[PDB]
Amino acid sequence: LGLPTEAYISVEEVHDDGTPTSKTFEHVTSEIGAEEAEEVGVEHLLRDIKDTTVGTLSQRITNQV
Amino acid sequence: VPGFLQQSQNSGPGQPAVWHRLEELYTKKLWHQLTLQVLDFVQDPCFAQGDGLIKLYENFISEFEHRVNPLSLVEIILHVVRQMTDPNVALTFLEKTREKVKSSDEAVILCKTAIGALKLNIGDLQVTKETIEDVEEMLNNLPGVTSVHSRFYDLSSKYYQTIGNHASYYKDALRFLGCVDIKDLPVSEQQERAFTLGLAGLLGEGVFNFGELLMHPVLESLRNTDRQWLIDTLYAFNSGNVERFQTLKTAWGQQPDLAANEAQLLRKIQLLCLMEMTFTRPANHRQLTFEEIAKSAKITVNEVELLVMKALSVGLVKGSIDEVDKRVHMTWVQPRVLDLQQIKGMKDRLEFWCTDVKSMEMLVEHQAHDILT
Amino acid sequence: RTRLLDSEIKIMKSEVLRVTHELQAMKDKIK
Amino acid sequence: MVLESTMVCVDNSEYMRNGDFLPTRLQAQQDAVNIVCHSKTRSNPENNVGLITLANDCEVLTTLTPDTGRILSKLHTVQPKGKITFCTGIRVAHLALKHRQGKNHKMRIIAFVGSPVEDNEKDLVKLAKRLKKEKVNVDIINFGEEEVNTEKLTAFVNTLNGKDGTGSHLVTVPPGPSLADALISSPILAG
């Protein structure tokens, strides 16, 4: 599910409701970078780049998670 | 100076002993004992103006001590104003000393907070309100002192004094709760401040958040000392909506403020009732008869045909409304907070439906296991 | 007076660090 | 050229602001660090000196280095205000000496106490017995002010150096103003 990296940024502020200190890490959106000739080491063994498995197993994964 | 502290400075009981100790600190050069213990004796208010007059002499001693201004100067100024009494030009002198000697920039922002408060006492919504804006710039984004933010809250509360803007009061009181160290605030003094917060402070149209501030624990416990029925009436306007019995009670709870804004508040509860149907009830019970809205707007059922349109007009939340029975069944709504313990969020609505989905997901797997491969 | 001399000595220590920084700046420039 | 690396712990606090020792206690503390770094340099050029405040924050002000230039810069603008937290700092200093790759260099800690420490005596004594197992010499020079008689520290030093141990000297602050040279002589005379 989701992605391996979790992004947190720690900031100091006054909570509007009034939590004391209000200093904590804040979650931020995270993404995967773009590289070339990187999965030749790994994906070459497997891979499934086709529309054949769309709606065959893709629906199962979404229902699964 | 050493002779002055030994005998003339003494006023309250134990003052000769503490001043003799202060002389030992002066010789020992222990600024920290002078910064905390000596200022702690100054903190005691029994001496009142007399300690403050002595404090001007002690301020010269403090200049030799060179104790950190954010701690030492602010405490000296807190009792310096008591010595000043009515400061027609005394305020300029204390501000001048604070400006001339600054251990840190943070102390300079503390000087600004004092300047604004003194200006507020002599003048209203003039340079002092602009100085309150200047203090926001001076504070910048640093809440580490926390007490400095409370001083910033004090001018923000002073801005509420300068212009009624009860919404500004609602923001400052919330800011005070965040920047207060804890419940270390004198409970009785805060309960007395909460008595005002329970009365004029929450009676002001500025705060009505269905318990976002009202159900916050520290203020409500202090507001318990304030009439409980008035405190209940404040919750009642937000979630009880029309609360006609509470409407009679609100006049009893606080005649000031409520009487002045009774028509405006009546309009606000009518808007609150319209928001209440959609967030509290999603579908089904969200749809309701025009007569219930007539009771909700405390208006006649024939009048509610006209009235629902006015409540709909505010359009605080975008939705779909059918006038067949004035049923809501609307779209987007923003609840200030969820009711109870978010019982709807548990198996009452959410979670239970999610459990049902995975069993159906298993049915998709059973339907086509070979295809999954 | 004596405190001013002590402040000058601290600045002199910073100047010794600055001579090392100048050598580092020269080394980066040399590359 | 005896090889030794010392993780000294400096103190920055409102107590350190007091200038009873020399013009300023912090300046005197900086002077004390200067002599020890010079003494280590005389003993061996490769000797590494590193220091950190033990008050409020106990990280690493400078990683241990043979050159003393970094040590001098860290002493500059030390900025004193944090309340002393000796227990966290002493634990950090001992492990930091192990952290250094060159463990062959002898491991020693010199610390300055400017304020009384609010810690259970048993808790510091338990750390001191662990320090004895680590077998790293620790000598503390109290500066300006300390818990009266440094009783907890005296027990801590005894636990650190018991059973005919190094018995590294613990210097309680001399009452009133103390010359930096007077403070430097006791560590030079014995650890």
PDB file of N, CA, C and O in Angstrom, chain B residues 28-33 35-36 68, chain D residues 14-15 17-20 23 25 145:
ATOM      1  N   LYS B  28      28.579  39.033  46.099  1.00  0.00           N
ATOM      2  CA  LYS B  28      28.934  37.717  45.501  1.00  0.00           C
ATOM      3  C   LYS B  28      28.853  37.802  43.975  1.00  0.00           C
ATOM      4  O   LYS B  28      29.371  36.875  43.321  1.00  0.00           O
ATOM      5  N   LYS B  29      28.171  38.825  43.447  1.00  0.00           N
ATOM      6  CA  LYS B  29      28.027  39.019  41.976  1.00  0.00           C
ATOM      7  C   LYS B  29      27.123  37.932  41.388  1.00  0.00           C
ATOM      8  O   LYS B  29      27.229  37.697  40.178  1.00  0.00           O
ATOM      9  N   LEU B  30      26.256  37.325  42.204  1.00  0.00           N
ATOM     10  CA  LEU B  30      25.375  36.229  41.721  1.00  0.00           C
ATOM     11  C   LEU B  30      24.142  36.859  41.076  1.00  0.00           C
ATOM     12  O   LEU B  30      23.115  36.976  41.772  1.00  0.00           O
ATOM     13  N   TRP B  31      24.226  37.199  39.788  1.00  0.00           N
ATOM     14  CA  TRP B  31      23.095  37.903  39.127  1.00  0.00           C
ATOM     15  C   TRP B  31      21.857  37.011  39.166  1.00  0.00           C
ATOM     16  O   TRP B  31      20.775  37.553  39.346  1.00  0.00           O
ATOM     17  N   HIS B  32      22.022  35.697  39.012  1.00  0.00           N
ATOM     18  CA  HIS B  32      20.855  34.779  38.920  1.00  0.00           C
ATOM     19  C   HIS B  32      20.001  34.868  40.182  1.00  0.00           C
ATOM     20  O   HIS B  32      18.765  34.909  40.055  1.00  0.00           O
ATOM     21  N   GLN B  33      20.638  34.904  41.350  1.00  0.00           N
ATOM     22  CA  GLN B  33      19.858  35.068  42.600  1.00  0.00           C
ATOM     23  C   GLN B  33      19.169  36.438  42.573  1.00  0.00           C
ATOM     24  O   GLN B  33      17.998  36.511  42.965  1.00  0.00           O
ATOM     25  N   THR B  35      18.352  38.080  39.813  1.00  0.00           N
ATOM     26  CA  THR B  35      17.355  38.030  38.713  1.00  0.00           C
ATOM     27  C   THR B  35      16.092  37.317  39.189  1.00  0.00           C
ATOM     28  O   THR B  35      14.993  37.761  38.821  1.00  0.00           O
ATOM     29  N   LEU B  36      16.238  36.236  39.957  1.00  0.00           N
ATOM     30  CA  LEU B  36      15.021  35.466  40.316  1.00  0.00           C
ATOM     31  C   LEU B  36      14.576  35.774  41.746  1.00  0.00           C
ATOM     32  O   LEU B  36      13.436  36.238  41.904  1.00  0.00           O
ATOM     33  N   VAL B  68      19.911  39.415  32.554  1.00  0.00           N
ATOM     34  CA  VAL B  68      19.315  39.354  31.185  1.00  0.00           C
ATOM     35  C   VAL B  68      18.026  40.180  31.169  1.00  0.00           C
ATOM     36  O   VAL B  68      17.169  39.953  32.037  1.00  0.00           O
TER      37      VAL B  68
ATOM     38  N   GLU D  14      22.428  30.872  33.261  1.00  0.00           N
ATOM     39  CA  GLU D  14      22.330  32.202  33.919  1.00  0.00           C
ATOM     40  C   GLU D  14      23.395  32.247  35.018  1.00  0.00           C
ATOM     41  O   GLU D  14      23.944  33.337  35.277  1.00  0.00           O
ATOM     42  N   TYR D  15      23.655  31.104  35.657  1.00  0.00           N
ATOM     43  CA  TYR D  15      24.709  31.035  36.700  1.00  0.00           C
ATOM     44  C   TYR D  15      26.065  31.381  36.077  1.00  0.00           C
ATOM     45  O   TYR D  15      26.808  32.175  36.675  1.00  0.00           O
ATOM     46  N   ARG D  17      26.611  33.319  33.694  1.00  0.00           N
ATOM     47  CA  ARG D  17      26.622  34.780  33.412  1.00  0.00           C
ATOM     48  C   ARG D  17      27.301  35.507  34.577  1.00  0.00           C
ATOM     49  O   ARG D  17      27.997  36.507  34.317  1.00  0.00           O
ATOM     50  N   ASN D  18      27.109  35.015  35.808  1.00  0.00           N
ATOM     51  CA  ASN D  18      27.754  35.651  36.988  1.00  0.00           C
ATOM     52  C   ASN D  18      29.263  35.693  36.743  1.00  0.00           C
ATOM     53  O   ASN D  18      29.798  34.715  36.205  1.00  0.00           O
ATOM     54  N   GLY D  19      29.913  36.797  37.108  1.00  0.00           N
ATOM     55  CA  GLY D  19      31.346  36.953  36.797  1.00  0.00           C
ATOM     56  C   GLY D  19      32.237  36.845  38.015  1.00  0.00           C
ATOM     57  O   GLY D  19      33.325  37.430  37.976  1.00  0.00           O
ATOM     58  N   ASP D  20      31.809  36.137  39.065  1.00  0.00           N
ATOM     59  CA  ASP D  20      32.623  36.139  40.311  1.00  0.00           C
ATOM     60  C   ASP D  20      34.031  35.616  40.001  1.00  0.00           C
ATOM     61  O   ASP D  20      34.993  36.259  40.445  1.00  0.00           O
ATOM     62  N   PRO D  23      36.767  38.348  35.305  1.00  0.00           N
ATOM     63  CA  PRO D  23      35.696  39.287  34.937  1.00  0.00           C
ATOM     64  C   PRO D  23      34.372  38.541  34.707  1.00  0.00           C
ATOM     65  O   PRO D  23      33.352  39.028  35.158  1.00  0.00           O
ATOM     66  N   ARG D  25      32.539  34.359  34.553  1.00  0.00           N
ATOM     67  CA  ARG D  25      32.728  32.903  34.791  1.00  0.00           C
ATOM     68  C   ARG D  25      32.902  32.192  33.446  1.00  0.00           C
ATOM     69  O   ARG D  25      33.731  31.270  33.374  1.00  0.00           O
ATOM     70  N   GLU D 145      29.387  28.598  41.063  1.00  0.00           N
ATOM     71  CA  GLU D 145      28.369  28.069  42.006  1.00  0.00           C
ATOM     72  C   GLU D 145      28.202  26.568  41.757  1.00  0.00           C
ATOM     73  O   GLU D 145      28.493  26.126  40.634  1.00  0.00           O
TER      74      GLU D 145
END
